[PDB]
Design a protein around this motif. Structure first.
Motif, PDB file in Angstrom:
ATOM      1  N   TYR A 259       0.825  -1.204   0.000  1.00 35.27           N
ATOM      2  CA  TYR A 259       0.000   0.000   0.000  1.00 35.27           C
ATOM      3  C   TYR A 259       0.861   1.256   0.000  1.00 35.27           C
ATOM      4  O   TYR A 259       0.565   2.219  -0.720  1.00 35.27           O
ATOM      5  CB  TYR A 259      -0.958   0.001   1.199  1.00 35.27           C
ATOM      6  CG  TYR A 259      -1.772   1.278   1.292  1.00 35.27           C
ATOM      7  CD1 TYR A 259      -2.721   1.579   0.331  1.00 35.27           C
ATOM      8  CD2 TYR A 259      -1.578   2.190   2.335  1.00 35.27           C
ATOM      9  CE1 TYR A 259      -3.460   2.744   0.397  1.00 35.27           C
ATOM     10  CE2 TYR A 259      -2.325   3.378   2.412  1.00 35.27           C
ATOM     11  CZ  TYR A 259      -3.258   3.643   1.438  1.00 35.27           C
ATOM     12  OH  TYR A 259      -4.001   4.799   1.479  1.00 35.27           O
ATOM     13  N   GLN A 260       1.932   1.271   0.800  1.00 33.16           N
ATOM     14  CA  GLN A 260       2.831   2.420   0.774  1.00 33.16           C
ATOM     15  C   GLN A 260       3.471   2.592  -0.597  1.00 33.16           C
ATOM     16  O   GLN A 260       3.741   3.722  -1.021  1.00 33.16           O
ATOM     17  CB  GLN A 260       3.905   2.283   1.851  1.00 33.16           C
ATOM     18  CG  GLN A 260       4.594   3.598   2.166  1.00 33.16           C
ATOM     19  CD  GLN A 260       3.617   4.683   2.640  1.00 33.16           C
ATOM     20  OE1 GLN A 260       3.811   5.866   2.346  1.00 33.16           O
ATOM     21  NE2 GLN A 260       2.565   4.281   3.378  1.00 33.16           N
ATOM     22  N   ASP A 261       3.712   1.491  -1.313  1.00 38.70           N
ATOM     23  CA  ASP A 261       4.271   1.617  -2.655  1.00 38.70           C
ATOM     24  C   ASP A 261       3.318   2.377  -3.572  1.00 38.70           C
ATOM     25  O   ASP A 261       3.746   3.254  -4.336  1.00 38.70           O
ATOM     26  CB  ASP A 261       4.592   0.236  -3.232  1.00 38.70           C
ATOM     27  CG  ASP A 261       5.777  -0.446  -2.531  1.00 38.70           C
ATOM     28  OD1 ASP A 261       6.332   0.118  -1.551  1.00 38.70           O
ATOM     29  OD2 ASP A 261       6.154  -1.558  -2.972  1.00 38.70           O
ATOM     30  N   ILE A 262       2.019   2.055  -3.512  1.00 37.89           N
ATOM     31  CA  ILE A 262       1.036   2.750  -4.345  1.00 37.89           C
ATOM     32  C   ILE A 262       1.024   4.239  -4.020  1.00 37.89           C
ATOM     33  O   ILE A 262       0.952   5.085  -4.923  1.00 37.89           O
ATOM     34  CB  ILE A 262      -0.365   2.126  -4.176  1.00 37.89           C
ATOM     35  CG1 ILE A 262      -0.419   0.725  -4.770  1.00 37.89           C
ATOM     36  CG2 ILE A 262      -1.441   3.014  -4.796  1.00 37.89           C
ATOM     37  CD1 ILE A 262      -1.290  -0.204  -3.946  1.00 37.89           C
ATOM     38  N   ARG A 263       1.077   4.588  -2.728  1.00 33.59           N
ATOM     39  CA  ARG A 263       1.116   6.004  -2.370  1.00 33.59           C
ATOM     40  C   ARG A 263       2.351   6.680  -2.956  1.00 33.59           C
ATOM     41  O   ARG A 263       2.268   7.801  -3.472  1.00 33.59           O
ATOM     42  CB  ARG A 263       1.070   6.179  -0.853  1.00 33.59           C
ATOM     43  CG  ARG A 263      -0.156   5.553  -0.191  1.00 33.59           C
ATOM     44  CD  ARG A 263      -0.590   6.302   1.079  1.00 33.59           C
ATOM     45  NE  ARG A 263       0.547   6.786   1.855  1.00 33.59           N
ATOM     46  CZ  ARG A 263       0.889   8.069   1.962  1.00 33.59           C
ATOM     47  NH1 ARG A 263       0.168   9.003   1.351  1.00 33.59           N
ATOM     48  NH2 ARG A 263       1.950   8.423   2.684  1.00 33.59           N
ATOM     49  N   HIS A 264       3.500   5.996  -2.915  1.00 35.04           N
ATOM     50  CA  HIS A 264       4.735   6.579  -3.431  1.00 35.04           C
ATOM     51  C   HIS A 264       4.658   6.807  -4.940  1.00 35.04           C
ATOM     52  O   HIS A 264       5.180   7.801  -5.456  1.00 35.04           O
ATOM     53  CB  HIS A 264       5.914   5.674  -3.065  1.00 35.04           C
ATOM     54  CG  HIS A 264       7.234   6.139  -3.607  1.00 35.04           C
ATOM     55  ND1 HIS A 264       8.061   7.000  -2.916  1.00 35.04           N
ATOM     56  CD2 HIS A 264       7.874   5.849  -4.767  1.00 35.04           C
ATOM     57  CE1 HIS A 264       9.149   7.226  -3.632  1.00 35.04           C
ATOM     58  NE2 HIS A 264       9.062   6.539  -4.758  1.00 35.04           N
ATOM     59  N   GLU A 265       4.002   5.913  -5.667  1.00 33.43           N
ATOM     60  CA  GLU A 265       3.905   6.067  -7.110  1.00 33.43           C
ATOM     61  C   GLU A 265       2.731   6.922  -7.568  1.00 33.43           C
ATOM     62  O   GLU A 265       2.725   7.364  -8.714  1.00 33.43           O
ATOM     63  CB  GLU A 265       3.797   4.701  -7.776  1.00 33.43           C
ATOM     64  CG  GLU A 265       4.980   3.805  -7.540  1.00 33.43           C
ATOM     65  CD  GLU A 265       4.627   2.351  -7.763  1.00 33.43           C
ATOM     66  OE1 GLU A 265       4.801   1.548  -6.815  1.00 33.43           O
ATOM     67  OE2 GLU A 265       4.160   2.018  -8.884  1.00 33.43           O
TER      68      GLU A 265
END
Length: 297
Positions: free
Chosen positions: A19-25
């Motif tokens: 989920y944090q990856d999606i926020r970062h991208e």
């Protein structure tokens, strides 16, 4: 396989990482209009704004701003409007938007009061005999009937443009048991609600984009649209494996920031799409099982 990916993420316990990856991208676009000083009191949350490129413009000359984004899913061929819970001063803007965008359904995923605070203006009438009139946008709104289920309610509303005397029927789908920042009680009760909205004709291409809101119009609203779009996409080629859930979410976040607000909501979205695939792939009986499991009465 989303089902395969889902299990790998569960085994390793890495939903927060994913989920944090999606926020970062996620995309980052300007929200210049939303930030104008004249619009401060049109925004419910300082950190939830619509991007300028995708925001819905009111057809008035005074101030065309409303906190609302058009999510146009090109490949899936479905549009949604995501917006915040109307404020006391924006209820007229909200219904003007419904009128000008030609929407047939309003999906409300929150309650007026949640966690002890008012999350949404009371923007529709609760009694047939007490209609509402929005003088600023010259609209009238009348409750016509209700179908009260155990955890959601469907209202039939008549919206009248008072300038032309043209009337329109709006369906209001009100989810009552979906906690702020949380997930629905079950996949079954979420999918049962979703298919009630689908069966009403509100998501049809003959109407305007369905309006979806919660409090800020990103968390619960994002979950609702992501699952629908993912189900619609695999409907198109009867190919569950062609659907990449994280890619759909990221494509949606091109049109509005912050869609899906917790890792558990992301995880729930998987569950819902995985369960709903049963129906897409030819098991029509699963729809009644959801209705049973949901206990709507």
């Amino acid at each position: 396989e989303m089902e395969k990916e889902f299990e790998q993420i569960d085994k390793s316990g890495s939903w927060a990482a994913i989920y944090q990856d999606i926020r970062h991208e996620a995309s980052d676009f300007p929200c210049r209009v939303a930030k104008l000083p004249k619009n401060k009191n049109r925004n419910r949350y300082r950190d939830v704004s619509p991007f300028d490129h995708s925001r819905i413009k009111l057809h008035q000359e005074d101030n065309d701003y409303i906190n609302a984004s058009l999510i146009k899913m090109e490949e899936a061929q479905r549009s949604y409007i995501l917006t915040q819970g109307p404020l006391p001063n924006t209820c007229g803007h909200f219904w003007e938007m419904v009128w000008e965008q030609k929407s047939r359904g309003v999906v409300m995923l929150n309650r007026v009061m949640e966690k002890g605070s008012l999350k949404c203006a009371q923007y529709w009438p609760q009694k047939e005999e007490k209609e509402m009139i929005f003088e600023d946008t010259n609209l009238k709104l009348t409750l016509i009937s209700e179908d009260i289920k155990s955890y959601y309610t469907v209202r039939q509303l008549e919206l009248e443009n008072l300038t032309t005397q043209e009337t329109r029927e709006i369906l209001h789908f009100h989810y009552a048991t979906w906690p702020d920042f949380g997930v629905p009680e079950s996949p079954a009760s979420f999918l049962n609600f979703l298919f009630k909205v689908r069966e009403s004709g509100s998501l049809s291409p003959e109407h305007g984009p369905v309006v979806v809101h919660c409090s800020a119009g990103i968390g619960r609203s994002g979950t609702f649209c992501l699952a629908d779009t993912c189900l619609l996409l695999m409907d198109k080629r009867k190919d569950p494996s062609s659907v990449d859930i994280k890619k759909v979410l990221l494509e949606m976040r091109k049109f509005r920031m912050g869609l899906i607000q917790t890792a558990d909501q992301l995880r729930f979205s998987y569950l819902a799409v995985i369960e709903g695939a049963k129906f897409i792939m030819g098991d029509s009986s699963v729809q009644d099982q959801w209705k049973e499991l949901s206990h709507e009465d």
